[PDB]
């Protein structure tokens, strides 16, 4: 229950919302998909499996409608742990949320915000991350301490953490207007 | 270290004898070493482009490099004379040619693809060889066929020229990111060709994927294109129970082994190990019986075509021709059995070569000559990109926007010089185009070339005065349309700073372009772009439940290498520090439960899978069980083999 | 215009007013044009971004610009959400940007670190950046080569700086070369920032144009090191833009290759260090007892000299003559120059873990998370980053050398060369003066006395000296004087303007202080023969000059686990005396510990299981990592 992907900047969304490619989310959350299809379509599991096989070779629309409803009605929203090889710094592994699915079939890049990039101490040079989903509802509450919300305060001193602040060009943009 | 004192700059004057792989990159005495050393690797990893163009600012050194690289073009060593040509397929055919100075014989084979490596290749632009027919004469300098890089007149080219500007677009260019217009994406392209080896045994059969029962087309035709990314699927057949298994062959079953590939199939070849009498009756093995026969026909042709040449008294043949003749005469004989991997296979095995064009997609990388590496982030329709709507030449639109933040911080001022040169070229070209007859037009050009590279002026004058009126007018129109080429050498002989200062001072009518909705002066130039090998689909991987290792832990499976699946179903391992960083939180039982139920305990894994599949999909409330894990048993067995045991309390 | 901010903050039309203002500024900015005069003055640009409007809070008047007003409403969201009026106490000047981090930290502690206020602040960051993106598109930021050229004509002082070559008619040491570059680079930043130009906004914000890196593009480079750190004695005399020469090209190639070798080597050995510390310092735990009961005489004593050390001791107790266990005051500077008694975890008493008093007032902040694991990640990560990023800075500093009175009066040293004033004076050297060189095996005469005719003054050269190659050829037979047991070197034989003695110098590596920190833990050079009161005092001195910003509590916990108590009972600290203790290397501290799970998973599998040097059979202490086994 794991996958690897790349990084691509994404704008116009809250700081803890990411958008995953169509292919990877259609296979990581594979078993739960068959459960949703079975009840609505009124067929057994063997017949539903061959339907999912055809819905992953080429982009379609019937599967996508069931896909969108899954990330809206479920409790807490589908989440996963994202880390970076290697991890040597605090916050190199986070606990994010899913809020968007890319329509394109040829797109194979993970879209994250720009502010969250500095926490991983990485860049868009072409590194490969590891994605691990979490399933159990009771287990989620124990992992919530690793969310970026809990890393807002600096453990070193007790002040506002400088990593989760304006960096790179965003510093320059404010200065032009502020002055 | 005082050994530097031997180096003296007196002798190293006006000669580039100390540069390797840097001859292509211009103004090499401006950028630092750390960025320059990346250019070598960038040139080492550069895929082929369909619409290759010669660079606008050339270093006058790539032509000889292209000539001395013999891996892309094939010319005639000596004057030949066509003897015969024979066909083998719809496209591929061979021809036998004879010398006029030694009497030897050689062969030339026309193709449609080339397998550079496991994934990347190119397509031959074979045009001259096709026009050759019916006992013509081949000269010394003629080129039979060439790659897509080389142009009509042997001029090299390994990239494209794109309008570029330095700009910031909604912070989408943070770090190293690039936006690109749709027209530039259409201009940029790439090729891809791959070979797939399918296998068939006596028990196995091929499903009727294409066509109805009248034409049991197991596999696509010679020139058709594949559909649904499935080339062929074979189903095992058992003697005991087949009544309820072969009822309908037009649909996939539960236990199938399909093969995945994408593109257009160009070349096939089939090798068989079964007697033809047994193969003549099987109805489902129909299409193969076609192609094999056709193949054999071709071989017979050669045995009846040039049998008078080699078997004759002359026998003056090259090694390649003799080897090919023996290989082709092997097949038509009797009682021959092939072998594969030093083993005798039972059923026949074929070959497929598939060609496909892959357009530019999000996530790819494109770099310039000076190693300003970037990554494509978001493509836009050409309307959104900035345009100039105030100057005389309203309409010019930038195609790529680069990061302006990291230009001085990266310590490489060559890009600014190149952009300024191309901008001054644009201005002088428009000024020449505005007015002026052919009598003085060239003068307006020459002045500009006088202050950039003094060596080029003499050749300019010689070439201009060499031609006649009509060709001169055509050349002037062409330079008006495309643009004035500017030449300058990498190390010795180029513009520095004082020359740029003087050039700016002399032209006083030049101002920055005023864009629309920007309120900041801007300059747009033309820069050289080369694609790179790195792609997102070559490393993307996902895994739900693949084959397990012998011990019980998940492990890498070799199925993607044989084109049996789409994704490289390889799990990602948790490292030494990953567990500790997870244990940063005071909770440990949750970590243990996750690890045990994910990749340690078989019963826990099965229980989790069942509880996830059946139940409530919206809300999950799984409850793991308590069963001794496999790793504990392995460790206990190993330690009791050593002679020690772990005791609690 | 005058908007009552107290009314607007609680008007309940927060979305309507903020959206309307956020649109008028952008709409107007995309119509006019910007003009640049490049002179000392500023062009009379007209913009809505800079207009004066009076802001009123509680009746007071605070004259602020329109551009600052919009940034105020965006950053003052939490007051509206909690329905609390805003007062002038939280107001701060918005002209600068580093003041923003002081505003956020004055918001968290004001609302008591509530879980609700964390969500609201997380919303402000998202909204502030999104509206920041729109300004960049409408205004535009460009880098152009013509910007520098145009500035040259208007400002005369810039033309001289662009074409500047090091004079070669005067002798200059390697210390004077660094002075010239810094002198010229400092003047560049004054002219560019003060006067209007394209790059004015690039420098004032200080985000994108590093001061040292940008100097190399315009001014001369200077000197570069080599594969073995020795300074190459051929300074580059031409800037990057002005061009390079073949001899200069070779020197540049050496610097680039060193980066690849260092980067590749560090990648191969990167996680080796962090594994050792993480495995040991993991079992610590926090109890909620108010005070353990440690005797006052066992409190750690520290010495404070610089104000920086005071910054390392924040929110921790200290002992006073009249006050007991009072909180320390960072702002008060009366504590400097004197020693203090700071309770510390190294002398904690509870057998389970540190209490509230010993740890300090940071207990609330890090109550939920583990305490041990924060310390190890807070230290290793900055250490590795500095070993990479700082080492990438090839340019290195130089140190002054005191040659001596007689050395200066007779030899004016130019780079790696020596020249005498008068060639008549000879030199007398004894046979025993020559010594074998460590590397080149050549003769090096560190000390000698010149034979200045009848007069003579001894020379104490601080650095090693290499004899001239030309003069050594005749030394074998002619200048060889074994009869008097003293070589005679007549400088009159040497021609005028010729080399006499070449000396090599090693630069002061910036990574040298960082390495000694690693050597302290393992090498046992200093840690063996000292007590705890000296090591932590020594430990702080290493971090002070290194530049790492780490609180004292997250650095001392390493010492707590490094030290081992023979009695194996922390309650012994309740008595007056200090029980005997021995410090160990971090590798041997874990092996000779008392746990079993940590020992098997660390290293040396054969040694622990075959023999009993570490006595593996008598380690039964529980651990949090035993669940894996
Ligand atoms: Zn205590």
Flag whether C184 is marked binding. Answer: no
Q: Rounded to whole angstroms, how far apart are CA atoms A84 and B593?
A: 23
Residue C85 CA to ligand 1 center (angstroms) comes to 43
C329 closest CA partner among C317, C338, C342, C345 = C317
Taking residue B458's Cβ as centre, other Cβ atoms within 10 Å add up to: 9
Could you tell me the two tokens for C473?
């050829």
Question: Strands B365-367, B524-531: parallel, antiparallel or unpaired by DSSP?
Answer: antiparallel
Q: What is the 3-state secondary structure (H, E, C) of B216-272?
A: CECCCCCCCECCCCCCEEEECCCCCCCCCCCCCCCCCCCCCEEECCCCEEEEEEEEC
Burial A53-83 (b: 16+ CB within 10 A, else e): eebbeeeeeebeeebeebbeebeeebbbbbb
CB-count burial class (<10 Å; 0-12, 13-18, 19+) for B3: exposed
With beta carbons less than 8 A apart as the criterion, state whether C299 and C341 touch: yes
With beta carbons less than 8 A apart as the criterion, state whether A114 and B171 touch: yes
Closest Cα in chain B to A167:
B174
Q: Rounded to whole angstroms, how far apart are CA atoms B420 and B503?
A: 11
Q: 3-class DSSP state for residue B540?
A: coil
In this complex, which of C104, C136, C551 lies closest to A173 when CB atoms are compared? C136
Could you tell me the two tokens for B411?
């310590």
CB-count burial class (<10 Å; 0-12, 13-18, 19+) for C568: exposed
Q: Rounded to whole angstroms, how far apart are CA atoms B163 and B397?
A: 7
**Chain C residues with beta carbon closer than 8 angstroms to that of A179:** 67, 95
With beta carbons less than 8 A apart as the criterion, state whether C463 and C396 touch: no
Q: Rounded to whole angstroms, how far apart are CA atoms C412 and B187?
A: 66
Residues in chain A: 179
A4 near B CB under 8 A:
yes
Long-range contact set of residues B301-304: C-beta below 8 Å, sequence gap at least 24: B301/B86, B302/B86, B302/B328, B302/B329, B303/B328, B303/B329, B303/B332
Burial B182-194 (b: 16+ CB within 10 A, else e): eebbebbbbbbbb
Q: 3-class DSSP state for residue C436?
A: strand
Handedness of CA C171, C175, C180, C181 (dihedral sign): positive
Alpha helices by DSSP H, listed for C287-444, are 307-311, 356-359, 372-392, 405-410
Taking residue B152's Cβ as centre, other Cβ atoms within 10 Å add up to: 7
Burial B71-89 (b: 16+ CB within 10 A, else e): ebbeebeeebebbebeebb
A124 near B CB under 8 A:
yes
Closest Cα in chain A to B566:
A57
Q: What is the 3-state secondary structure (H, E, C) of B109-173?
A: EECCCECCCCCCCECCCCCHHHHCCCCCEECCCCEEEECCCCCCCCCCCCEEEEEEEECCCCCCC
A123, A143, A178, best to mutate vs chain C, most C CBs in 10 Å: A178
A113 near B CB under 8 A:
no
Q: Between residues 263 and 322 of chain C, which touch chain A (CB distance below 8 Å)? A: 270-271, 274, 314-315
Interchain contact, C108 vs A153, CB within 8 Å = yes
DSSP C126-164: HHHHHHHHHHHHHH-----HHHHHHHHHH-HHHHHHHS-
Question: Strands B80-87, B374-380: parallel, antiparallel or unpaired by DSSP?
Answer: unpaired
B531 closest CA partner among B292, B185, B198 = B185
Could you tell me the two tokens for C231?
């300074």
Burial C417-426 (b: 16+ CB within 10 A, else e): bbbbeebebb
Residue C277 CA to ligand 1 center (angstroms) comes to 23
Place of tokens 């939490």: C78
- Show Cβ contacts of residue B493 under 8 Å, excluding neighbours closer than 6 positions: B14, B453, B455
**In the beta sheet, which residues pair with residue B491?**
none
Taking residue C301's Cβ as centre, other Cβ atoms within 10 Å add up to: 13
How many CB pairs below 8 A link B and C?
A: 174
**Chain B residues with beta carbon closer than 8 angstroms to that of C609:** 642, 644
Interchain contact, B612 vs A85, CB within 8 Å = no
Could you tell me the two tokens for B515?
């864009």
Q: Between residues 145 and 174 of chain A, which touch chain B (CB distance below 8 Å)? A: 145-146, 168-170, 172-173
Q: How far away is chain A from the Cα of B387, in angstroms, using its nearest Cα?
A: 22
- Residue C67 vs residues A92, B1, B234, C48: alpha-carbon distances, Å: 37, 58, 70, 8
B22, B27, B497, B644, best to mutate vs chain C, most C CBs in 10 Å: B497
Q: How far away is chain C from the Cα of A146, in angstroms, using its nearest Cα?
A: 10
In this complex, which of B4, B518, B585 lies closest to C232 when CB atoms are compared? B4
Taking residue C611's Cβ as centre, other Cβ atoms within 10 Å add up to: 10
Q: Rounded to whole angstroms, how far apart are CA atoms B624 and B608?
A: 7
Q: Rounded to whole angstroms, how far apart are CA atoms B260 and A53?
A: 13
Interchain contact, A27 vs B254, CB within 8 Å = no
A175 near C CB under 8 A:
yes
With beta carbons less than 8 A apart as the criterion, state whether B105 and B316 touch: yes
**Chain A residues with beta carbon closer than 8 angstroms to that of B185:** none
**In the beta sheet, which residues pair with residue A2?**
B543
C287 closest CA partner among C241, C236, C231, C354 = C354
Neighbours, chain B (3 or more CB pairs < 8 A) = A, C
Any idea what DSSP says for residue C591?
Answer: H
Cis peptide preceding A86, ω within 30 of 0:
yes
Residue C316 CA to ligand 1 center (angstroms) comes to 13
Place of tokens 């005797």: C295
With beta carbons less than 8 A apart as the criterion, state whether C273 and C329 touch: no
Q: Rounded to whole angstroms, how far apart are CA atoms C7 and C57?
A: 9
Phi then psi dihedrals of residue B265, to 5 deg: -75, 130
In this complex, which of A13, A88, A156 lies closest to C384 when CB atoms are compared? A88
Taking residue A48's Cβ as centre, other Cβ atoms within 10 Å add up to: 20
Place of tokens 């107001």: C91
**In the beta sheet, which residues pair with residue B137?**
B81
Closest Cα in chain A to B588:
A142
CB-count burial class (<10 Å; 0-12, 13-18, 19+) for B597: buried
A31, A71, A79, A82, best to mutate vs chain B, most B CBs in 10 Å: A31
**Chain C residues with beta carbon closer than 8 angstroms to that of B601:** none
Residue C348 CA to ligand 1 center (angstroms) comes to 4
- Show Cβ contacts of residue B303 under 8 Å, excluding neighbours closer than 6 positions: B328, B329, B332
Tell me how far apart the terminal alpha carbons of chain A are, to the nearest angstrom: 50
C111 near A CB under 8 A:
no
Place of tokens 């040298």: C512
Could you tell me the two tokens for C463?
């650095």
Q: What is the resolution of this structure in A?
A: 3.8
Q: Rounded to whole angstroms, how far apart are CA atoms C374 and B400?
A: 44
With beta carbons less than 8 A apart as the criterion, state whether B375 and A124 touch: yes
Side-chain-side CA neighbours of C432 within 13 Å: the count stands at 0
What determination technique applies here?
cryo-EM
**In the beta sheet, which residues pair with residue B145?**
B74
Q: Rounded to whole angstroms, how far apart are CA atoms C265 and B41?
A: 19
Interchain contact, A149 vs C365, CB within 8 Å = no
Burial B378-408 (b: 16+ CB within 10 A, else e): beeeeeebbbbeeeeeeeebbbbbbbbbbbb
- Residue B107 vs residues B160, B304, B413: alpha-carbon distances, Å: 36, 17, 52
How many CB pairs below 8 A link A and C?
A: 129
A33, A74, A108, A127, best to mutate vs chain B, most B CBs in 10 Å: A108
Quick one: angle between helices B414-434 and C145-154, nearest 10?
Answer: 80
* Chain CA centroid to CA B33, Å: 28
Q: Rounded to whole angstroms, how far apart are CA atoms B266 and B288?
A: 16
Interchain contact, B496 vs C139, CB within 8 Å = no
Q: How far away is chain A from the Cα of B49, in angstroms, using its nearest Cα?
A: 20
Q: Rounded to whole angstroms, how far apart are CA atoms C191 and C402?
A: 36
Q: Is A124 left (phi over 0), alpha (psi -120 to 50) or beta?
A: alpha
Quick one: angle between helices C372-392 and C512-522, nearest 10?
Answer: 140
Interchain contact, C149 vs B501, CB within 8 Å = yes
**In the beta sheet, which residues pair with residue A133?**
A80
Flag whether C412 is marked binding. Answer: no
Instruction: Write down the number of H helices and E strands in chain C.
Output: 24, 17
Q: Rounded to whole angstroms, how far apart are CA atoms B278 and B289?
A: 11
In this complex, which of A145, A170, A172 lies closest to C201 when CB atoms are compared? A172
Q: How far away is chain C from the Cα of B288, in angstroms, using its nearest Cα?
A: 54
Interchain contact, C243 vs B497, CB within 8 Å = yes
Residue C578 CA to ligand 1 center (angstroms) comes to 15
Q: Rounded to whole angstroms, how far apart are CA atoms B384 and B515?
A: 13
Q: Rounded to whole angstroms, how far apart are CA atoms C411 and C89?
A: 66
With beta carbons less than 8 A apart as the criterion, state whether C573 and C579 touch: yes
Q: Rounded to whole angstroms, how far apart are CA atoms C181 and C160?
A: 14
Q: Rounded to whole angstroms, how far apart are CA atoms B52 and B149?
A: 6
With beta carbons less than 8 A apart as the criterion, state whether C235 and C245 touch: no
Tell me how far apart the terminal alpha carbons of chain C are, to the nearest angstrom: 72
Any idea what DSSP says for residue C406?
Answer: H
With beta carbons less than 8 A apart as the criterion, state whether B356 and B264 touch: yes
Interchain contact, C135 vs A179, CB within 8 Å = no
Could you tell me the two tokens for B34?
């750390």
Q: Rounded to whole angstroms, how far apart are CA atoms C310 and B549?
A: 58
- Show Cβ contacts of residue B640 under 8 Å, excluding neighbours closer than 6 positions: none
B144 closest CA partner among B85, B88, B103, B190 = B85
Q: Rounded to whole angstroms, how far apart are CA atoms C23 and C213?
A: 39
Angle among Cα B86, B90, B92 to the nearest 5 degrees reads: 55
B252 closest CA partner among B208, B294, B306 = B208
A19, A139, A150, best to mutate vs chain B, most B CBs in 10 Å: A139
Could you tell me the two tokens for B132?
């050759």
CB-count burial class (<10 Å; 0-12, 13-18, 19+) for C89: exposed
With beta carbons less than 8 A apart as the criterion, state whether B359 and B183 touch: no
Flag whether C355 is marked binding. Answer: yes
With beta carbons less than 8 A apart as the criterion, state whether C551 and C272 touch: no
**Chain A residues with beta carbon closer than 8 angstroms to that of C205:** 171-172, 175
Residue C374 CA to ligand 1 center (angstroms) comes to 19
Flag whether C298 is marked binding. Answer: no
What range does the domain containing C175 cover? Answer: 145-255
Taking residue A114's Cβ as centre, other Cβ atoms within 10 Å add up to: 22
Which strand (E) or helix (H) includes residue B428?
A: helix B414-434
**In the beta sheet, which residues pair with residue C4?**
C56
Q: Rounded to whole angstroms, how far apart are CA atoms B22 and B39?
A: 8
Beta strand residue intervals within B20-79, DSSP E: 57-58, 73-75
Phi then psi dihedrals of residue C158, to 5 deg: -75, -30
Could you tell me the two tokens for C490?
């007549």
- Residue C299 vs residues C318, C325, C349, C538, C563: alpha-carbon distances, Å: 10, 11, 12, 17, 16
Phi then psi dihedrals of residue B146, to 5 deg: -145, 160
Taking residue C531's Cβ as centre, other Cβ atoms within 10 Å add up to: 11
C127, C135, C200, C551, best to mutate vs chain A, most A CBs in 10 Å: C135
Q: Rounded to whole angstroms, how far apart are CA atoms A126 and A113?
A: 16
C362 near A CB under 8 A:
yes
In this complex, which of C121, C130, C381 lies closest to A89 when CB atoms are compared? C381
Q: Rounded to whole angstroms, how far apart are CA atoms C199 and A93?
A: 38
Could you tell me the two tokens for B67?
């000539």
Give the torsion through C-alpha atoms of A90, A93, A94, A99, to 10 deg.
150
Taking residue B645's Cβ as centre, other Cβ atoms within 10 Å add up to: 8
Residue C522 CA to ligand 1 center (angstroms) comes to 28
With beta carbons less than 8 A apart as the criterion, state whether B54 and B526 touch: no
């Amino acid at each position: 229950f794991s996958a690897r992907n790349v990084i691509t900047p994404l704008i116009g969304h809250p700081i803890d919302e990411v958008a995953m490619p169509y292919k990877t989310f259609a296979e990581l959350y594979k078993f739960q998909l068959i459960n949703l299809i079975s009840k609505v379509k009124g067929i057994n599991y063997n017949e539903a499996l061959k339907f999912w096989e055809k819905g992953i070779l080429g982009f379609n629309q019937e599967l996508y409608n069931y896909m969108e409803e899954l990330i809206t009605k479920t409790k807490g929203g589908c989440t996963f742990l994202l880390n970076r090889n290697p991890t040597i710094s605090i916050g190199s592994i986070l606990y994010l949320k899913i809020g968007l699915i890319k329509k394109d079939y040829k797109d194979l890049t993970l879209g994250i915000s720009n502010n969250l990039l500095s926490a991983l101490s990485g860049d868009y040079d072409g590194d490969v991350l590891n994605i691990i989903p979490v399933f159990d509802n009771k287990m989620k509450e124990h992992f919530s301490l690793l969310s970026p919300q809990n890393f807002l305060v600096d453990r070193n001193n007790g002040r506002f953490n400088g990593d989760f602040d304006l960096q790179k060009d965003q510093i320059l943009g404010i200065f032009i207007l502020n002055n | 270290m005082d050994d530097i004192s031997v180096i003296k700059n007196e002798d190293y004057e006006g000669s580039h004898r100390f540069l390797a792989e840097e001859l292509l990159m211009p103004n090499a005495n401006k950028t630092d070493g750390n960025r320059s050393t990346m250019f070598c690797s960038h040139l080492a990893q550069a895929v082929t482009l369909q619409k290759a163009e010669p660079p606008l600012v050339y270093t006058n050194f790539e032509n000889q490099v292209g000539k001395y690289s013999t891996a892309g073009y094939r010319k005639a060593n000596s004057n030949y004379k066509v003897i015969e040509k024979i066909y083998k397929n719809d496209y591929n055919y061979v021809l036998i040619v004879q010398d006029q100075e030694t009497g030897e014989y050689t062969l030339f084979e026309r193709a449609e693809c080339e397998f550079l490596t496991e994934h990347y290749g190119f397509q031959w632009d074979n045009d001259k060889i096709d026009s050759l027919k019916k006992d013509d004469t081949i000269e010394k300098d003629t080129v039979l066929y060439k790659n897509t890089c080389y142009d009509e007149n042997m001029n090299f080219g390994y990239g494209v020229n794109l309008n570029a500007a330095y700009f910031s677009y909604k912070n989408e260019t943070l770090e190293d990111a690039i936006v690109i217009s749709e027209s530039a994406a259409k201009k940029l392209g790439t090729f891809s060709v791959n070979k797939v080896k399918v296998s068939v045994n006596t028990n196995d059969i091929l499903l009727n994927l294409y066509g109805d029962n009248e034409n049991y087309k197991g596999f696509p035709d010679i020139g058709e294109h594949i559909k649904n990314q499935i080339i062929a699927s074979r189903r095992r057949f058992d003697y005991n129970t087949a009544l309820y298994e072969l009822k309908n062959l037009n649909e996939m079953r539960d236990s199938d082994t399909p093969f995945f590939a994408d593109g257009k199939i160009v070349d096939i070849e089939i090798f068989s190990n079964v007697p033809e009498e047994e193969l003549k009756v099987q109805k489902y093995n129909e299409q193969v019986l076609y192609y094999i026969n056709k193949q054999k026909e071709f071989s017979n042709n050669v045995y009846q075509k040039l049998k008078k040449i080699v078997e004759g008294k002359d026998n003056n043949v090259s090694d390649k021709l003799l080897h090919f003749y023996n290989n082709c005469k092997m097949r038509i004989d009797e009682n021959i059995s092939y072998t594969y991997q030093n083993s005798k296979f039972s059923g026949f095995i074929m070959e497929f070569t598939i060609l496909e064009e892959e357009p530019l997609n999000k996530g790819s990388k494109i770099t310039g000559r000076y190693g300003n590496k970037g990554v494509i982030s978001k493509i836009l329709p050409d309307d959104q990109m900035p345009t100039v709507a105030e100057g005389r030449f309203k309409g010019l639109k930038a195609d790529i926007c680069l990061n302006p933040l990291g230009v001085f911080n990266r310590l490489n001022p060559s890009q600014l010089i190149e952009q300024e040169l191309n901008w001054i070229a644009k201005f002088i070209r428009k000024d020449m185009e505005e007015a002026g007859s052919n009598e003085e037009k060239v003068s307006i050009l020459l002045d500009f070339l006088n202050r950039v590279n003094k060596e080029e002026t003499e050749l300019m004058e010689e070439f201009i005065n060499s031609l006649n009126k009509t060709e001169l007018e055509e050349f002037l129109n062409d330079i008006i349309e495309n643009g004035i080429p500017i030449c300058q050498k990498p190390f010795f002989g180029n513009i520095g700073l004082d020359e740029l200062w003087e050039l700016y001072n002399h032209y006083d009518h030049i101002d920055y372009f005023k864009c629309e909705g920007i309120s900041t002066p801007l300059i747009i130039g033309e820069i050289y772009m080369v694609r790179l090998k790195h792609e997102p689909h070559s490393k993307f991987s996902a895994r739900s439940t693949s084959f397990m290792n012998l011990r019980g832990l998940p492990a890498k499976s070799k199925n993607f290498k044989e084109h049996k699946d789409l994704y490289s179903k390889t799990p990602v391992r948790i490292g030494n520090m990953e567990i500790s960083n997870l244990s940063l939180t005071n909770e440990m039982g949750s970590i243990m439960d996750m690890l045990n139920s994910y990749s340690n305990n078989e019963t826990n894994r099965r229980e989790l899978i069942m509880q996830l599949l059946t139940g409530n999909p919206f809300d999950t409330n799984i409850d793991l069980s308590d069963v001794e894990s496999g790793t504990s048993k392995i460790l206990k067995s190993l330690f009791t083999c050593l002679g020690l045991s772990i005791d609690d309390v | 215009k005058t908007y009552n901010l107290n009314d607007i903050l609680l008007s309940n039309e927060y979305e309507k007013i903020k959206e309307d203002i956020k649109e008028e500024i952008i709409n107007d900015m995309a119509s006019k044009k910007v003009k640049y005069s490049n002179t000392s003055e500023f062009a009379k640009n007209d913009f809505l971004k800079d207009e004066f409007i009076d802001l009123v809070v509680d009746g007071e008047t605070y004259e602020i610009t329109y551009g600052n007003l919009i940034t105020l409403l965006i950053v003052a969201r939490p007051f509206n959400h909690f329905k609390v009026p805003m007062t002038e106490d939280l107001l701060f000047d918005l002209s600068d940007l580093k003041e923003y981090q002081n505003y956020y930290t004055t918001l968290l502690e004001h609302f008591g670190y509530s879980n609700e206020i964390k969500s609201i602040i997380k919303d402000v960051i998202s909204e502030l950046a999104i509206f920041s993106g729109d300004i960049n598109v409408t205004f535009g930021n460009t880098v152009s080569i013509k910007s520098l050229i145009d500035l040259g004509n208007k400002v005369k002082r810039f033309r001289e700086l662009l074409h500047y070559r090091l004079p070669n008619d005067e002798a200059l040491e390697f210390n004077d070369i660094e002075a010239i570059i810094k002198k010229n680079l400092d003047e560049i930043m004054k002219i560019l920032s003060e006067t209007d130009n394209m790059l004015r906004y690039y420098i004032d914000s200080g985000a994108g144009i590093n001061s040292k890196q940008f100097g190399q593009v315009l001014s001369l480079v200077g000197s570069k090191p080599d594969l073995f750190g020795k300074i190459i004695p051929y300074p580059i005399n031409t800037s990057f833009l002005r061009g390079l020469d073949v001899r200069s090209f070779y020197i540049n190639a050496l610097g680039a290759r060193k980066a690849l070798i260092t980067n590749y080597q560090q990648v191969r050995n990167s996680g080796y260090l962090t594994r050792k510390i993480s495995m040991l310092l993991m079992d610590t735990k926090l109890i909620d007892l108010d005070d353990c009961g440690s005797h006052e005489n066992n409190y750690l004593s520290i010495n404070v000299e610089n104000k920086d050390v005071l910054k390392r001791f924040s929110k921790r107790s200290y002992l006073n003559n009249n006050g007991e266990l009072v909180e320390i005051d960072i702002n008060d500077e009366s504590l400097i120059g004197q020693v203090i008694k700071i309770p510390s975890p190294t002398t904690c008493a509870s057998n389970e873990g540190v209490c509230r008093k010993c740890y300090g007032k940071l207990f609330d902040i890090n109550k939920d998370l583990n305490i041990g694991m924060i310390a190890v990640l807070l230290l290793t990560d900055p250490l590795t980053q500095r070993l990479l990023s700082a080492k990438h800075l090839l340019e290195t500093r130089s140190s002054k050398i005191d040659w001596g009175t007689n050395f200066e009066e007779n030899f004016i040293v130019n780079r790696n060369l020596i020249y005498p004033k008068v060639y008549n004076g000879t030199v007398i050297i004894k046979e025993d003066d020559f010594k074998e060189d460590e590397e080149t095996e050549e003769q090096v005469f560190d000390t000698f006395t010149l034979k200045s005719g009848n007069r003579f003054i001894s020379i104490s050269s601080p650095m090693r000296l290499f004899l001239n190659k030309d003069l050594k050829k005749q030394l074998d037979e002619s200048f060889y004087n074994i009869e008097e047991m003293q070589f005679e070197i007549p400088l009159n034989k040497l021609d005028e303007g010729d080399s006499f003695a070449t000396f090599i110098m090693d630069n002061n590596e910036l990574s040298k202080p960082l390495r000694e920190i690693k050597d302290l833990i393992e090498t046992n050079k200093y840690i063996k023969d000292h007590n705890v009161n000296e090591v932590v005092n020594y430990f702080i001195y290493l971090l002070n000059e290194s530049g790492i910003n780490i609180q004292s509590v997250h650095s001392e916990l390493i010492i707590r686990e490094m030290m081992k108590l023979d009695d194996s009972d922390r309650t012994q600290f309740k008595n007056d005396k200090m029980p005997d203790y021995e410090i160990f290397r971090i590798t041997d501290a874990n092996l000779k510990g008392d746990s079993l799970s940590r020992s098997l998973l660390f290293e040396q599998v054969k040694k622990q299981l075959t023999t009993l040097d570490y006595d593996t059979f008598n380690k039964t202490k529980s651990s949090i990592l035993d669940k894996l086994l």
